[PDB]
Amino acid sequence: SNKKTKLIHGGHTTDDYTGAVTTPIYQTSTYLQDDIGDLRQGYEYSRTANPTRSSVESVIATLENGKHGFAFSSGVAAISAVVMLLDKGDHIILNSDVYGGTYRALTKVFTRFGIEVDFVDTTHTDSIVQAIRPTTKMLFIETPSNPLLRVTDIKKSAEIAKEHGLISVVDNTFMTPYYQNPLDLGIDIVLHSATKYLGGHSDVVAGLVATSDDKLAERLAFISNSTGGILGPQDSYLLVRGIKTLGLRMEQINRSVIEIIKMLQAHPAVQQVFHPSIESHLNHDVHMAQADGHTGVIAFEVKNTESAKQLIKATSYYTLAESLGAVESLISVPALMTHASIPADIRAKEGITDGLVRISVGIEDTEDLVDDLKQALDTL
Amino acid sequence: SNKKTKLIHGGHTTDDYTGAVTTPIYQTSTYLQDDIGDLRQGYEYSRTANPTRSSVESVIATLENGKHGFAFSSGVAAISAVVMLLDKGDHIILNSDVYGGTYRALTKVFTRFGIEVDFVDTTHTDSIVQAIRPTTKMLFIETPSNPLLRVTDIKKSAEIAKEHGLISVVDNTFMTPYYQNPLDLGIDIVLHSATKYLGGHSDVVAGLVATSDDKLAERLAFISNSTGGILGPQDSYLLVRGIKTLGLRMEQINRSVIEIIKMLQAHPAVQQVFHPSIESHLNHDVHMAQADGHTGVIAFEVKNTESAKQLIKATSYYTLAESLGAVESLISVPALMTHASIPADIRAKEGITDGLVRISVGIEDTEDLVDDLKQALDTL
Amino acid sequence: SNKKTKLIHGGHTTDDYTGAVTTPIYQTSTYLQDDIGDLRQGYEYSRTANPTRSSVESVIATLENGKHGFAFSSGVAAISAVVMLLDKGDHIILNSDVYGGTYRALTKVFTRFGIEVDFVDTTHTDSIVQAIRPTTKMLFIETPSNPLLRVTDIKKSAEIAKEHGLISVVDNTFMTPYYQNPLDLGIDIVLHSATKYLGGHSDVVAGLVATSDDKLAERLAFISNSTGGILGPQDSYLLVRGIKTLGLRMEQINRSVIEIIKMLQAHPAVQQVFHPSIESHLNHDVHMAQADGHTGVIAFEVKNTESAKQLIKATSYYTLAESLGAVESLISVPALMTHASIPADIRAKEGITDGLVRISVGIEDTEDLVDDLKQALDTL
Amino acid sequence: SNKKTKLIHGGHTTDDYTGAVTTPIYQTSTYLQDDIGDLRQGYEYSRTANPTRSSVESVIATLENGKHGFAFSSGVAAISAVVMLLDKGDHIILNSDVYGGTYRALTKVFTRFGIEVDFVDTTHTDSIVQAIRPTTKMLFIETPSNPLLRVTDIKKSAEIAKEHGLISVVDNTFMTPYYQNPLDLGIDIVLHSATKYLGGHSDVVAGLVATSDDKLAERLAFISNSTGGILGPQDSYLLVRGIKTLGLRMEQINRSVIEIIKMLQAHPAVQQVFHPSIESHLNHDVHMAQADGHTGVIAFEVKNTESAKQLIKATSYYTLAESLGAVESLISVPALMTHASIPADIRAKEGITDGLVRISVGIEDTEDLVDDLKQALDTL
Ligand SMILES: *Cc1c(COP(=O)(O)O)cnc(C)c1O
Ligand SMILES: *Cc1c(COP(=O)(O)O)cnc(C)c1O
Ligand SMILES: *Cc1c(COP(=O)(O)O)cnc(C)c1O
Ligand SMILES: *Cc1c(COP(=O)(O)O)cnc(C)c1O
Ligand code: NA
Ligand code: NA
Ligand code: NA
Ligand code: NA
Ligand code: NA
Ligand code: NA
Ligand code: NA
Ligand code: NA
Ligand code: NA
Ligand code: NA
Ligand code: NA
Ligand code: NA
């Protein structure tokens, strides 16, 4: 019924055999056959299917209102499996602000296989219509984007993809299924770095994919079984466990996001602030119409790299590390860390400047997070 | 010094920090940075590197006498990462009876990416020389192959690859590093389904790759980080643990293999046996020159499908399941299981006859395994 | 600073060596020594100490404002270790409403070792003063109690224990350190079934003990090392992970508790309701003074066993199972399940009747939990 | 049939539900009930029973030819559960060189509970008969003992226990079920530190108990459920896995033991060797009659403390650490490590001399272990 209930009881995460209230961890590679080809419960080889992986796959399918879920060894592995739906000579359109690893995978791996890529400013969806070539087969969107939180109209993107015969993909990592459900808006495939919010505890690297399209699901299952980027059973289990608290965690994070943004907008050492909740933010109305909450990722400008480093050293509760969506609050400078692989001239033009700080708000106390960041900013 | 000692003390499998005699399980996604880019021990994000995965990578590098190891979420994922060393338009030669998953990855995924393939019978290495084009970049061989245990000259394949500028790859799953070391014989890259003997306990799906080539290692590390088919920390740990007993397990398996083959050759219900230890086996001398032991996979032909099925039902200690390299002895009928898509009128041409049985010998008592298979054969 | 921050950053739950932001899982039994008796990080044998166990021990010590923490294989193992502080001939006073397993351990195991036990109604603390014998060495209190939520004044109990030379113990399972901190009120030892709220995810059986008393800590460490009821490293890790979300979970649970109790008090099929938040509940003022929230365990009376069974079968979101403090809402009938080991005549006199239902409120949506239980009660 | 087969196929270590060839890891605390008291597969709460723990319990029962198995959080916890079979005033006889932790549990915990103890030299079983009182209820023996490998007649101890109405217990850690089966010789209860050989990989702390006596099993199950020193599911799984290779590991260890002893007896720097395989060892004939192999623990005397320390520093393949039964060969000096509390002037009386070295032989190559220890001895 309501989302917090669906998080606990949606999907298949109990044991039918013993009645155990959590998913057993099937640390196993193969399964006894009663007769040649007769599988007790449909399992024959864990790369093809594993019951704990099946559990987390059923969870992600349920939460995104899809029919089929797939668990991969990492988010980039989910992305690579989706890109392998295409052949040499196919073209894919992506939004122009994208995760550094997605940029690197597409431009340094898949272009070697003849897959053509254009990064387009999808914050106006008619840009997509101009960018469509006769060879375009896929439209791939992050919203909000990493790290500038650019917002793209999901429903309009889906309509464009349907009209032009494209596979539409949304990377829904930043919003989670708790706040934004691209499949409900006509998107073909939705995917996640489950490394971030879904796992939620900085202890699993994993990717998740969901679709309602039977033929896309069959093609993805074939790719996963043939290239083998599958999530292991222990990580699958820890993902199910982490997902249990996703709603509580996202709601704490959102409460903190609101206050932190107020502080940041008022602070003299802070210039521009990037977050879809700010009403002057481009496509703020689009975000409010396609999501009912916010990501915990915030970007904001300080003067320069050296102020950014001072800010990082003055905080007590923000941890300098990669990733986002942890219970711990994280801080980074994308131009020097996660987005160093994006060329510097494109970084400068897009606004990923040397003094752009990114924070992932965690689930610490709101007043502590605001006060800590504010006194650190006061140090400058 | 000797192999059984190297298995215990090779690689880095203790904790330098606490002194723990086993590798800690780093169930973690990210690592605190003391300053931007300043990593205490070189770790920043578990997809890029994870200390438990690094442990198992050091083990496989040591055991294969290489410099660099890589752990992937499956053997198929290791194979796919190695094939992604190539670009659209490059050509690769493989043995024609290569593992079905390798066949499917190449012909149903990578040919869509413009990679050209020739499948040749490599038991005569001039087959390889005939297939070489100006575009050939890679030579990929299993030895011995499945399920007929065809043997390929590793030293000559390496010489061919060196002379023509190819990256040579050996899938050494069936022999393990305990008996055959392709890198010592001039091969560029060696890889394993660690799902089989290396893990040894039918409880991990995993791939391992080793090389001594710094630039190949740099390229593989880039592919692994960008497409993300990495092995998780729990599975890496179980791999290190399983590998500890690899020599004891392989030696037990080999004693049973020898006695079982003696039984099979004497039995009236058996028309033919396939195993490289048999002196009339093709390239027996080649195998004895490049390996100092044997795989536990044996194939043998009985009268028909129904005799094969009877054999499965009459054994007490042979388990009907997919995979190989378990502690349990496993039994299968390739024409009904792994090769069912190949037609009956055509089966004879490839050698996958209706009465072809494959066993993966486990570590049960030799006398029990011999006696059990023998009395089952006596029921025919 | 504030509790939600302390939950994330309190205790030592990162890796000093690699910087990993979560506690490594030291699946290990022993530790290399650089010289005889020289321990790299103080570890020599995992039963004596294990770094992952040390992590969860530091967490529980921090959260209860103690100096020493101890992790046991179960709550009853924590309780048995604490009872083994006493000798044959010592006497212990417990409150008269206690967990069924605690009753069974004391009356069927430890009385065989000459430890004398009286269960006293501690809801008036002067009862304790009358019950003190010359041999009384320990005072052991649950508050609120299981399953009737009787409340005992912790501070007054501690004053009595100090004045009469008793070791005071509070079983703080139901309140968690998030709402009630017995050590701050003068109690010597605080303990938990970490199986319940602390782990929070129905996937760990564990006990935790905390004290500020150096000599009690030394005696407990000796008992734990000599009788060996230690928590394993994987369970220790899952406990740390679960504890991360304790504040969010308890706050959701408390929001639901308030509404569910309103519904239950208004419902015609429900007679008496047991929960410390109800202002007519005995020692409601005492509870509000020693805790700043509520447990999620509620007991209430329906007509009889058969109405209780009907109620259980009519709910959609309440799971019939043992334990409490899960993310899933649980329902039980204590007289038939957890408290069957308490004799029936004592059950009837104390109010643990055949129609007494116990619910553990989980973290599902409040409106769903209220509506589901209400329509189920309407079925009667 | 034969032992190596029984190790693989004995006990229940597959999943009946999915057919998984390994035991699922039930990381869970509680189980859904279809109706109050109606359990799908007999599970209601993981302290009482857990399916992964039940798997390892069935394994130890099978391997020791018993009916009932019990898994505890440590060997010391198994020992404590067995001792809690007694009441205040009961008397127990143990061999006088019993494991230090057993000595401490009995003399520093259980004597405070009114249990009376005699420590006697059991290498002559009439020692036992002399110590029997009317209050004697239990006889508890290790064979062979640590670190001098004293041998005790199991059959005669069982006859003594039967004649006088005692519960007989054998701590069979050093021999494992692979070589010695006390229950077959009339003993009531057999137990193990599974931390050592059974786990085999220095990565689990665990205890195991087996019996054929239904009423003893009922009493043990009650003690385990009420004091809660249960083994967790992850450790139970790692135990099942490690036990798979127990026979291969013990046989390798035994080959190395034989050759190493040949070396030690010939060496001028060695005054004396302690191991039951030596024909002049006390009760060598008794050991050969009750066991069909040997432990890997060997002790031998060199000149003094400084020669022992030199020996440790000169070895390449012997690791300085606590515990025994690793895949690594371990080396220790009992007078400086396990027996340091015993005074120097008194050391001689017990036989723990200053130059007494203990090694636990691992599964490294026999020639390496012999050569390494020999060249180290040559440095003296
Ligand atoms: C409510 C609920 C659903 C359905 O949720 P929708 O928002 O209607 O898709 C599915 N599963 C569970 C467990 C639920 O509680
Ligand atoms: C013997 C040994 C080696 C070297 O083995 P080679 O086959 O000679 O390369 C490496 N590491 C360890 C731990 C060894 O014992
Ligand atoms: C605030 C805080 C503490 C201290 O909490 P008290 O309530 O003063 O005992 C300890 N550790 C961390 C991480 C904190 O944030
Ligand atoms: C042989 C065998 C047994 C019986 O072993 P005994 O020593 O004769 O009791 C039991 N279980 C399995 C799986 C066996 O192979
Ligand atoms: Na469910
Ligand atoms: Na659709
Ligand atoms: Na090493
Ligand atoms: Na071709
Ligand atoms: Na040619
Ligand atoms: Na080379
Ligand atoms: Na911390
Ligand atoms: Na105090
Ligand atoms: Na079996
Ligand atoms: Na005595
Ligand atoms: Na006497
Ligand atoms: Na008996």
Residues B234 and B317 in one domain: no
Q: What is the per-residue DSSP string for D195-250?
A: TTTTT-SS----EEEEES-HHHHHHHHHHHHHH--BPPHHHHHHHHHHHHTHHHHH
Q: Which residue of A has its CA nearest to B202?
A: A29
What single letter denotes the amino acid at residue B205?
V
| Residue D91 CA, ligand 14 centroid: distance in Å | 8
- The values of phi and psi at residue B176, to 5°, are 65, 160
Q: Does C285 touch chain A (CB under 8 A)?
A: no
> Looking at ligand 2, which residue's alpha carbon is closest to its atom 1?
B1
Tell me, what DSSP letter sits at residue D97? T
Catalytic annotation on C196?
A: yes
Residue C99 annotated in active site:
yes
DSSP secondary structure letters along C134-162: TTEEEEEEESS-TTT-----HHHHHHHHH
Which residues lie closer than 8 Å to B17 by C-beta, 6 or more apart? C15, C16, C17, C40, C41
Q: Which residues fall within 8 angstroms of residue A1, CB to CB, at 6 or more apart?
A: C365, C368
- Residue C245 to residue A241, Cβ atoms within 8 A: no
| Rg of chain B in Å (alpha carbons) | 21
3-state secondary structure chain B: CCHHHHHHHCCCCCCCCCCECCCCECCCCEECCCECCECCCCCCECCCCCHHHHHHHHHHHHHCCCCEEEEECCHHHHHHHHHCCCCCCCEEEEECCCCHHHHHHHHHHHHHHCCEEEEECCCCCHHHHHHCCCCEEEEEEECCCCCCCCCCCHHHHHHHHHHHCCEEEEECCCCHHHHCCHHHHCCCEEEEECCCCCCCCCCCCCEEEEECCHHHHHHHHHHHHHHCCECCHHHHHHHHHHHHCHHHHHHHHHHHHHHHHHHHHHCCCCCEEECCCCCCCCCHHHHHHHCCCCCCEEEEECCCHHHHHHHHHHCCCEEECCCCCCCCEEEECHHHCCCCCCCHHHHHHHCCCCCEEEEECCCCCHHHHHHHHHHHHHCC
CB-based contacts of C263, cutoff 8 Å, min separation 6: C370, C373, C374
| Interface residue B35 vs chain C (CB under 8 A) | no
Distance CA B162, CA A78 (A): 36
- A258 and A145 together in one domain: no
CATH number at residue D140: 3.40.640.10
User: If you compute the radius of gyration of chain C from its CA atoms, what whole number of angstroms results?
Assistant: 21
DSSP state of A231: P
For ligand 15, an ion, list residues with CB under 5 A.
D 130
- Does D45 lie at the interface with C, CB-CB under 8 angstroms? yes
Among D15, D30, D47, D237, the strongest candidate for a mutation testing the A interface, having the largest count of A CBs within 10 A, is D15
H or E element in which residue D136 lies: strand D136-142
Best mutation site among A30, A115, A317 for testing chain B: the one with the most B CBs within 10 Å? Answer: A30
Residue at a domain's end among B241, B266, B294: B241
DSSP at D25: B
- Respond yes or no on whether the N-terminal peptide bond of residue B268 is cis (omega within 30° of 0): no
Give me the number of domains chain C comprises: 2
- Angstrom CA distances, A180 to A63, A141, A143, A146, A175, stand at 10, 13, 10, 16, 6
Q: Single out the residue of B322, B301, B318 nearest to residue B99, CA to CA.
A: B322
Beta strand B136-142 with B167-171: parallel, antiparallel or unpaired? parallel
Chains that touch A (3 or more CB pairs under 8 A): B, C, D
Same domain, residue pair D10 and D45: yes
How many contacts (CB atoms, under 8 Å) link B and C? 87
**Residue A304 near chain B (CB below 8 Å):** no
Closest by Cβ to B22, choosing from D8, D203, D364: D203
Domain co-membership, A252 together with A296? yes
Which residues 6+ apart lie within 8 Å of A196 measured at CB?
A75, A173, A174, A323, A324, A325, A326
Give the separation between CA B299 and CA B316, rounded to whole angstroms: 19
* Experimental method of this PDB entry: X-ray
Q: What is each CA distance from D73 to A249, C5, C19, C27, C206, in whole angstroms?
A: 34, 33, 30, 14, 11
Whether chain D has a CB inside 8 Å of the CB on C263: the answer is no
Look at residue A192 and give its three-state secondary structure: strand
Across the interface, do D8 and B244 touch by the CB < 8 Å criterion? no
Q: Give the nearest ligand 1 atom to C364 CA.
A: 15
> Taking a C-beta distance cutoff of 8 angstroms, is the pair A164, A136 a contact?
yes
Whether residues C25 and B25 touch (CB distance < 8 A) is answered with yes
Do A246 and A229 share a structural domain? Answer: no
Q: Are residues A115 and A187 in the same domain?
A: yes
Tokens at residue D87, please?
A: 């009441």
Pairing of strands B329-332, B318-320: parallel
| CA proximity to B358, closest of B302, B284, B303 | B302
Boundary (domain end) residue, out of D226, D241, D256: D241
Verify that A226 and A305 share a domain, yes or no.
Answer: no
* Whether C48 contacts chain B with CB within 8 A: no
Residues D70 and D195 in one domain: yes
Q: What is the CATH number of the domain that holds B268?
A: 3.90.1150.10
Strands (E), A316-366: 318-320, 329-332, 356-360
The phi and psi torsions of B300 (rounded to 5 degrees) equal: -155, 150
Give residue A352's domain range: 242-379
Radius of gyration of chain A (CA): 21
C167 and C68 assigned to the same domain: yes
Q: Which long-range contacts (CB under 8 A, 24 or more apart) does D282-289 make?
A: D282/D123, D282/D150, D282/D151, D283/D123, D283/D150, D283/D151, D283/D152, D283/D153, D284/D151, D286/D151, D286/D152, D286/D153, D287/D143, D287/D144, D287/D151, D289/D155
For residues C168 and C282, state if they share a domain.
Answer: no
| Cα angle D15, B377, B306; round to 5 | 75
Q: Of C143, C251, C266, C271, whose CA–CA distance to C200 is shortest?
A: C251
- Decide which of C201, C223, C241 is a domain's last residue: C241
Q: Select from A29, A84, A225 the Cβ nearest to the Cβ of B204.
A: A29
CB atoms within 10 A of CB D339: 18
Q: Is B171 a catalytic residue?
A: yes
Length of chain A measured in residues: 380
The Cα of D280 is separated from the nearest Cα of chain C by a number of Å equal to 32
The answer to whether A31 contacts B321, with C-beta atoms less than 8 Å apart, is: yes
Which helix (H) or strand (E) segment holds residue D258: the answer is helix D246-266
Tokens of residue B185, six digits = 């014989």
- D228, D358: one domain: no
For an interface test with C, give the residue of A59, A197, A330, A365 to mutate (most C CBs within 10 A).
Answer: A365
B131 CA from centroid of ligand 9 (Å): 5
A 10 A CB-CB count for A65 gives 15
Residue with the smallest CA separation from ligand 1 atom 4 is A1
Spatial CA neighbour of B324 closest among B351, B362, B370: B362
Give the number of other Cβ atoms within 10 Å of residue A171's Cβ.
27
- Are A75 and A195 contained in the same domain? yes
